Amino acid sequence: RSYQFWDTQPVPKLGEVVNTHGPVEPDKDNIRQEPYTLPQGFTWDALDLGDRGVLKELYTLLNENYVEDDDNMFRFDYSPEFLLWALRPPGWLPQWHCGVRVVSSRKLVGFISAIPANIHIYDTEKKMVEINFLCVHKKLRSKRVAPVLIREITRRVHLEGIFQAVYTAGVVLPKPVGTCRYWHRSLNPRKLIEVKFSHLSRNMTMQRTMKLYRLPETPKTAGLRPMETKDIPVVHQLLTRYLKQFHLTPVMSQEEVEHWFYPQENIIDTFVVENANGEVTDFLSFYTLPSTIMNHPTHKSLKAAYSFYNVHTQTPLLDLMSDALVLAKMKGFDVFNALDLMENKTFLEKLKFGIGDGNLQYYLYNWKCPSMGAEKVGLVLQ
Template identity: 35%
Template sequence: MFWNGQTVMQAHEEIDEHTNEEIFPLDVSKISQTPTKLPDGMEWCVIDPEDEDAVSAVHRFLAENYVEDNEGNFRFRYSYGFIRWVFGQPGAEKEWLVGIKSGGAIVGFISGFPVRVSVREKEVCMAEVDFLCLDRSMRKKGIAPLLIREMGRRVNAKGCGQAVYTVGGRITRPFTAARYYHRQISIRKLLSVGFSVLPRGSTVEEYEKMNRICVDGAGVFRRTTKADVKTIKSLLDETKDRWEVRRVFSEEEIEYVFCSDGGVVSLVSEDKDTFISFYTVSTVAIKENTEILCGYIYYYAAKRKADLLGAVRSVLSLCQEMGVDVLNCLDGMENGVFIGELGFVPGDGMLHYYLFNWKLGYTPSEKVFLSLL
C-alpha cells in the first residue's frame, strides 16, 4: 500500500495523546530536482493561475470528475470564479498547481497552498493539499500516488516539510475526524433529488414548516470590507487559546479571504465582537441533472461562544436570500453551540484530517480550527 511507505502516522501505531513532533527532519539539499517519472504518453504540467484558458481547463476537469458520494448520485461542481479565487491566494506557489496531461488533455490534478498552522503552540509551515482528482479512465492505475509524490517533492523543494489534508475515508491514522451536518432550506427541491428523506408520518408541508428559517435572535451583521481586517485579526487572536490546532492568518490573507469579493462570504457584527464566513459550492444530482447550491460554514470567531447562535441565524437568513438550498457544517470547532438549536441534522459523511510528516496525538474535533475548501 502506498501510504505504508510515507512519513505519516500509520494506523497500527501506538501514539500518546501528548505527542506533537516532526516525523523526519527535512533536508532540502537531498530533495530530487527531477520530476516523478510518469507512464509513457503522460507529462506534467503547471497551471498558471493568470492563464484563463488553463484555469478553465482545470475547472471543466473538476466539474466532470471531482468528488462524488459513494452511490454516485451527487458530485461537487465548483464555479470557475471560485476556482480562480482559490488559485490566487496570497503566497500561492504556481508550481504547486500540478496537472498530468495525456494527449493534450488534463487527466489528473492536485493543488497545494502554503499555510501556517499552530499545532499545540508550535507554528508550522504546511501545504494545504486539496483537489486531488483523476479522470475516470485513470483510476486504479497507480496514478494518484504519483500525483501525491510529485506534490510532496515540490513542496519539500521549497523548504516546507509538512502538509495537511482531508479525506472522506480513513486511509492511515487521522489526528481528528468530524461528521457532516446539514441545515435544509429548500425542502421540496432536496426531497425531489433524494438529498433529503421525508420523515415517516410527515407531510411535505409539515416538514417545510419544521425547517422554516427563523431570524428571531439573529444578530445585527453586515458584509465585511477591507476596513475590517484588523477587527477580524483581533478576534482570531483573542480566541486562539480555544484551539489545539488552528490556522494562523496574516492580515494579507484575512483581506483576501474574508474582506474581498472572492469565493467566501463574510459577515461581522455591528459591535465587532463576532465574525463568521461561509462559501457556496454547487452539488449536481447526477441522475436528475439538477444543481443543489450548498453553503459551507468556514471560519469564524466570537468573543462569546453564545453569540455564534445569532451569527449562524444571520447566515441562514442570507443563504435563503441567496437561493442556497442547504447549509452544511461539521460537528467540530464550536459548531455544537448551534447545530441542535438551529435544526442541523446529521449526514452520512465523515471527514478525516491528516498530517504529512507530523505526529500528533488524537485531538477532539472541537479543538481543531481548520477548514479546508
C-alpha cells in the first residue's frame, strides 16, 4: 500500500533499515496557530469530559463507532468512568480531547486524544504524548477526516512543546517499533463458545472444556490483597525498577502510579503481595473493558479483563498470573486477555492462554530507532 498521508509524516518508511536513534525532524520553533481546515459543515470542539453530557456524547460515539473485530460480532464498550480514567491522568489538557462536530446539529462525529507521558526508549527518556481513541463516525468514513484529526492533535501537542508521540494500532503503518500479539485465557468457556469468541475443538466435549479451564476458587499466593493508599510508594518503586529491563516503557511519577493502579471498581484492579515481614514484594493488575456482542439472542456483553502491569520480585510470575486469573474469574469476567510483551511469553502457554488473531503494532512519531521484539516492549495502553 502506498501511504498518501503517512509518507508526508516524520516516521521511518516501511522496510527502511534503522541503525540510528533520534528524531526524524528538528523541534519546530514556530507553530501554526490556526486549526486545520475540516470539510464544509464540520467544526472543532474541545470536549470537557467534566460535563457529564459531553462525556456521554463521547461514550456514545465510541460505543457505536470504535474498534470492532473483522466479522462485526464485537465492539469495545468503554464506560464513561473508564474514559475519565484513560483520558484524565495527571497533566491531561482539555485541548487534547479533540472533537469534531457537525456545524448545524452539533452532533459529535469525530475524536482523537493525547495524554502526556514520560517515555523511556532505549537510552533516551523523552516527554511524549500517547495518542488514543481516534474515531470517525461510520457515516464519515473514507473522506480523509482521520488525517485532519492526526494533524490537528499533532499541532495542539506541538503548541505545548512536545515533538514525539507513542501510539498503537491493529493496522500496519510506517513503521512499527514492535509487534505484539493478543492471547486469551478462557474463564467462562461455555459463554465464549456460545457467542463464537472461541470454538469447541471437534475432539472435546463442553464438560471436558469446562474441566480443562477450571480454576481454583481462591488464590494461592501468601499475603495477596488489594492495593491500598499506603502501597502507592512501594508499587511505584517496584514498577520503576522492574521496567528498566525493557526498551520501551513509561516512566511514571508517584501521582501517575496512584492514577493508573489505585483500584476503581469496574475499571482497574491491583493486588499486591505483602509477605510475612510486612514488605510488598509483588503486584498484579488488570483493567476492565467489556465488548458489546451484536446479534446474539441471549448474551449482550462480553466481560474481558486485560493484563496491565505485573511486577514480580519474590513470587514466581507464573504463580502471580495464576492468581490474576483466579481473581478475574471470581469477579465474573468471561475472558482474560494479555499481550506477548514484557515476560508474558514465559506464562501464556503454561496457563492455557490461546493465541488470538489480532496484532498490536507499536509506533513512535518523530523518533527513529531500531525495532525490538515483543519481549522488550514494556508499555500497555488502554
